[PDB]
Amino acid sequence: KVQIINKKLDLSNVQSKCGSKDNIKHVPGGGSVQIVYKPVDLSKVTSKCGSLGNIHHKPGGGQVEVKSEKLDFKDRVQSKIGSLDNITHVPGGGNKKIETHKLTFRE
Amino acid sequence: KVQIINKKLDLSNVQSKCGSKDNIKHVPGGGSVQIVYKPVDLSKVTSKCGSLGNIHHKPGGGQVEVKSEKLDFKDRVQSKIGSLDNITHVPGGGNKKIETHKLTFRE
Amino acid sequence: KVQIINKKLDLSNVQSKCGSKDNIKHVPGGGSVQIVYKPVDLSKVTSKCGSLGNIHHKPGGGQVEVKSEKLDFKDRVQSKIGSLDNITHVPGGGNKKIETHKLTFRE
Amino acid sequence: KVQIINKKLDLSNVQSKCGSKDNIKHVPGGGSVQIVYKPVDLSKVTSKCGSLGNIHHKPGGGQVEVKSEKLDFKDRVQSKIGSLDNITHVPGGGNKKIETHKLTFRE
Amino acid sequence: KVQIINKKLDLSNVQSKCGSKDNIKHVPGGGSVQIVYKPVDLSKVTSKCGSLGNIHHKPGGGQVEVKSEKLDFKDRVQSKIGSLDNITHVPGGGNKKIETHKLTFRE
Amino acid sequence: KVQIINKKLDLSNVQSKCGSKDNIKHVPGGGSVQIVYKPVDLSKVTSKCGSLGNIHHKPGGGQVEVKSEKLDFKDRVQSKIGSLDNITHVPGGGNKKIETHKLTFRE
Numbered sequence: 001k002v003q004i005i006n007k008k009l010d011l012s013n014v015q016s017k018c019g020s021k022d023n024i025k026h027v028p029g030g031g032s033v034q035i036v037y038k039p040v041d042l043s044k045v046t047s048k049c050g051s052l053g054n055i056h057h058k059p060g061g062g063q064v065e066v067k068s069e070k071l072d073f074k075d076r077v078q079s080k081i082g083s084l085d086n087i088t089h090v091p092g093g094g095n096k097k098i099e100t101h102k103l104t105f106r107e
Numbered sequence: 108k109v110q111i112i113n114k115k116l117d118l119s120n121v122q123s124k125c126g127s128k129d130n131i132k133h134v135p136g137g138g139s140v141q142i143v144y145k146p147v148d149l150s151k152v153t154s155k156c157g158s159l160g161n162i163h164h165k166p167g168g169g170q171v172e173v174k175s176e177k178l179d180f181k182d183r184v185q186s187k188i189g190s191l192d193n194i195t196h197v198p199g200g201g202n203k204k205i206e207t208h209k210l211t212f213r214e
Numbered sequence: 215k216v217q218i219i220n221k222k223l224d225l226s227n228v229q230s231k232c233g234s235k236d237n238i239k240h241v242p243g244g245g246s247v248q249i250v251y252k253p254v255d256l257s258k259v260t261s262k263c264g265s266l267g268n269i270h271h272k273p274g275g276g277q278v279e280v281k282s283e284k285l286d287f288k289d290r291v292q293s294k295i296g297s298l299d300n301i302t303h304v305p306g307g308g309n310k311k312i313e314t315h316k317l318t319f320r321e
Numbered sequence: 322k323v324q325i326i327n328k329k330l331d332l333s334n335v336q337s338k339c340g341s342k343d344n345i346k347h348v349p350g351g352g353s354v355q356i357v358y359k360p361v362d363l364s365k366v367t368s369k370c371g372s373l374g375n376i377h378h379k380p381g382g383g384q385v386e387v388k389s390e391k392l393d394f395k396d397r398v399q400s401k402i403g404s405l406d407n408i409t410h411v412p413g414g415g416n417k418k419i420e421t422h423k424l425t426f427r428e
Numbered sequence: 429k430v431q432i433i434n435k436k437l438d439l440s441n442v443q444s445k446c447g448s449k450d451n452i453k454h455v456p457g458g459g460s461v462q463i464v465y466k467p468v469d470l471s472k473v474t475s476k477c478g479s480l481g482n483i484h485h486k487p488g489g490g491q492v493e494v495k496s497e498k499l500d501f502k503d504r505v506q507s508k509i510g511s512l513d514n515i516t517h518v519p520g521g522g523n524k525k526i527e528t529h530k531l532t533f534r535e
Numbered sequence: 536k537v538q539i540i541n542k543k544l545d546l547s548n549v550q551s552k553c554g555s556k557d558n559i560k561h562v563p564g565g566g567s568v569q570i571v572y573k574p575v576d577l578s579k580v581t582s583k584c585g586s587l588g589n590i591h592h593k594p595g596g597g598q599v600e601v602k603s604e605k606l607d608f609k610d611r612v613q614s615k616i617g618s619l620d621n622i623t624h625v626p627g628g629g630n631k632k633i634e635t636h637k638l639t640f641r642e
Contacts, residue, residue, distance in 0.1 A: 004111045011118045018125045018147055025132045029186060031178060032135040035142045037169055037276075038126060043150045050158040050267070061167030061274055067174045074181045074502060074609040077137055081188045084132075087195070094200040094307070101208045103113055107218075108215045118225045125232045125254055132239045136293060138285060139242040144251045144276055145233060151258045157265040168274030174281045179288070181395060181502040181609060184244055186293045191239075194301045201307040205314075210220055212319045288395040288502060322429045325642075327531055332439045339446045340466060346453045346512075349460040351505055358465045361446055365472045372478040374585070381489030381596055383465055383572075388495045392459060395500070400457060400507045408515045414522040414629070421526075426533045432539045434638055439546045446553045447573060453560045453619075456567040458612055463570045468553055471578045479585040488596030490572055495602045499566060502609045507564060509616045516622070521629040529636045 004105070013042055025084065030077040033066060111212070120149055132191065137184040140173060218319070227256055239298065244291040247280060325426070334363055346405065351398040354387060432533070441470055453512065458505040461494060539640070548577055560619065565612040568601060 019038045026034045039062065049055055126145045133141045146169065156162055233252045240248045253276065263269055340359045347355045360383065370376055447466045454462045467490065477483055554573045561569045574597065584590055 001108045002110065005114075007112070007114045007117070009116045009119050012116070013120045013149060013151070015122045015125065015147075015149065017123060017127050019145070020124070020126070021128045022126070023130045023132075024143075025130075026141070027134045028139065029136045029184060030180065031138045032133065033140045033173065034133055035140070035171060036131065037144045037146070037171070039146045039148065039169065040125075041146065041148045043152070045150065045152045045154070045164075047152075047154045047156065047162070049156045049162065050160040050265075052159045052161075053156065054161045054163075055156075056163045056165075058163070058165045059167060061169045063170045063172070065172045068176065068178070070177045071175070072177070072179045072181065072610075073137070075607075076183045077180065078183070078185045079134075079136065079187070081134075081186075081191075083189060083193065084191045086193045089194070089196045091198045092200055093202075095202045097202070097204045099204075099206045103208075103210045105111055105113070105212045107109055107111055107212075107214045110217045112217075112219045112221075114219065114221045114224070116223045116226045119223070120227045120256060120258065122229045122232065122254075122256065124230060124234050126252070127231070127234045129233070129236045130238070131250075132237075133248070134240065135242045135246070136244055136291065137242070137287070138245045139240065140247045140280065141240055142247075142249045142278060143238065144253070144278070146253045146255065146276065147232075148253065149256045151260075152271075153260045154269070155262045156269065157263050157267040159266045159268075160263065161268045162263075162270060164269075164271045164273075166273045169276045171276070171278045173279060174283075175285070176283045178282070178285045179503075180244070180286070181288045182500075183289060184287065184291045186241075186243065186295075188241075188293075188295045188298075190297045190300065192299045192301065194299075194303075196301070196303045198305045199307055200309075202309045204309070204311045206312060208315045210315075210317045210319075212218055212220070214216055214218055214319075214321045286396075289393075323535055324431045324433075325533055325535055326433045326435065327533070328433075328435045330437045330440070331435070333437050334441045336443045337445060338448070339443070339468075340450070341445050341448045343450045344453075345451070345464065347455065347460065347462055348507075348509075349456045349458070350507065351457055351501070352459045353456070354461045354463075355454070356463045357452075359447070360465070360467045360469065361443075362467065363441060363443065363470045365441065367472075367474045369476045370478050370481065370483075372585075373480045374478040375480075375482045376475070376477065376485075377483060378473075378485045380485075380487045383467065383490045383492070385463060385465070385492045386494060387461065389499070390495075390497045392496070392499045393501070394458070394505065395502045396504060398457065398505045400509075402507075402509045404511045405509075406513045406515075407511065408513065408517070410515075410517045412519045414520055416522055417524045419524070419526045422529045422531075424531045426531075426535075428535045429536045430642055431537065432640055432642055433542070434640070435540075435542045437544045437547070438542070440544050441548045443550045444552060445555070446550065446575075447555070447557070448552050449556045451558045451560075452571065453558075454567065454569055455562045455614075455616075457564045457614065458608070459566045460563065461568045461570070462561070464559075465572045466554070467572070467574045467576065468550075469574065469576045470548060470550065471580065472548070473578070473580045473582075475580070475582045477582065477584045477588065477590075480587045481585040482587075482589045483582070483584065484589075484591045484593070485580075486591075486593045488594060490574065490596045491598045492570060492572070493598070493600045494568065496606070497603065498605045498607070499603070500607045501565065501612065502607065504611045504613070505564060506613045507616075508614070510618060512616075512619045514618065514621045515624070517624045519626045521627055523628075523630045523632070525632045525634075527634045529638075531638045533640045533642075535642045
């Protein structure tokens with residue numbers, strides 16, 4: 001009766017880089033709406049019920065409401081732009097990622 | 108009775124780079140709506156019920172509502188643009204990704 | 215009774231680079247709507263029921279609503295553009311991806 | 322040598338009701354020019370000249386000059402009219418114009 | 429040598445009701461020019477000249493100059509009118525104009 | 536040598552009711568010019584000249600100059616009118632104009 005087990009994950013939710021490295025840029029001249037909706041939502045619902053069990057699982061969702069009624073721009077909207085986002089994203093390293101995962105079993 | 112098991116994942120939800128490396132750019136002159144809807148949604152619903160069990164699983168979804176009523180631009184909308192997004196994304200590294208996954212079993 | 219098992223994944227949901235490396239760019243002159251709808255949605259629904267079990271699984275979906283009523287641009291909409299997106303995406307590395315996955319079994 | 326003369330007019334310019342009983346009415350909605358030019362002009366030019374007599378009779382006439390360059394009516398011109406000129410011009414008199422001009426000559 | 433003369437007018441300029449009983453009415457909504465030009469002009473020019481006589485009779489005439497350059501009415505011009513000119517011009521007199529002009533000559 | 540003369544006018548300029556009984560009414564909503572030009576002009580020019588006589592009779596005439604450059608009415612021009620000019624011009628007299636002009640000559 002020699003029992004030997006190596007096991008990584010049995011019941012797991014792994015979420016990496018969720019809503020990540022994000023640039024949201026707005027240059028309105030006039031009358032502009034920008035909307036960004038990033039729900040990162042995670043649920044383990046384990047449920048045991050019965051016998052007239054009245055379960056009402058109701059996660060209210062998000063709401064966005066916009067009402068513009070009176071908007072007038074009588075004369076002038078002018079946008080003179082030179083330069084957005086001068087980005088040198090320079091990864092210059094000759095990196096070494098050594099990832100040892102070694103599995104020795106002598107029975 | 109020599110039992111030996113190596114096993115990585117049995118019940119797993121892995122989510123990598125979800126909604127990732129994202130650029131959202133708006134240059135409205137006049138009267139513009141930009142909408143971005145990134146729900147990253149994850150559920151393990153384990154349910155055991157019965158016997159008049161009345162289950163009401165209702166995750167409200169997201170809502171977006173836009174109402175513009177009065178909008179006038181009587182004279183001038185002008186957009187003179189030189190340069191957006193001067194991006195040198197320079198990965199210059201001669202990287203080494205060593206990934207050892209070795210499986211030794213001597214029975 | 216010599217039992218030996220190597221096994222990677224039994225019950226697994228793997229999602230890599232989902233909604234990833236995304237550029238959304240809008241240059242409206244006048245009267246523009248941009249809509250982006252990226253739901254990355256993941257569900258393990260394990261259900262055991264019966265006996266008048268009334269299951270109502272109802273994930274509300276997302277809603278987008280746009281109503282423009284009064285919109286007039288009496289005179290001028292002008293867009294003079296030089297340059298969008300000067301992108302040198304330069305991967306210049308002679309990378310080495312060493313991926314060892316070795317399977318030794320001596321019975 | 323009995324000389325008797327009755328004589329009314331020898332050298333006469335008579336002008337009665339000249340530019341008279343005049344109604345000029347303008348109800349412009351938008352962009353209207355109304356021009357009225359009533360010169361009542363009277364000249365007795367008695368001239369005796371000669372011998373290199375250089376006569377330059379030059380009555381400058383009237384000038385009217387209208388220059389409209391930039392005229393825009395972007396949205397609305399509305400004219401709702403009930404009643405112009407409710408005129409009871411009522412001459413109600415049984416007038417008597419007795420005009421005696423009697424010419425008695427007993428020679 | 430009995431000389432008898434009755435004589436009314438020899439050298440006469442008579443001008444009655446010149447530019448008379450005049451109504452000029454303007455109800456502009458927008459952008460209106462009304463021009464009225466009533467010159468009542470009277471000249472007895474008696475001239476005797478000669479011998480290199482250089483006569484320059486130059487009555488400058490009237491000038492009217494109108495220059496509109498920038499005129500915009502972006503939204504609304506509305507004219508709601510009930511009643512102009514409720515005129516009871518009531519001559520109600522039974523007038524008597526007795527005009528005796530009697531010419532008695534007993535020679 | 537019995538000389539008898541009755542004579543009314545020899546060298547006469549008579550001007551009655553010149554520019555007379557005049558109503559000039561303006562109800563501009565927006566941007567209106569009203570111009571009225573009533574010159575009542577009277578000249579007896581008696582001239583005797585010669586012998587290099589350089590006569591320069593130059594009556595400068597009247598000038599009217601209007602220059603509008605920048606004129607904008609961005610939103611609203613409204614004119615609601617009930618009543619102009621409720622005029623009872625009531626001559627109600629039974630007048631008597633007795634005009635005796637009688638010419639008795641007994642030679």
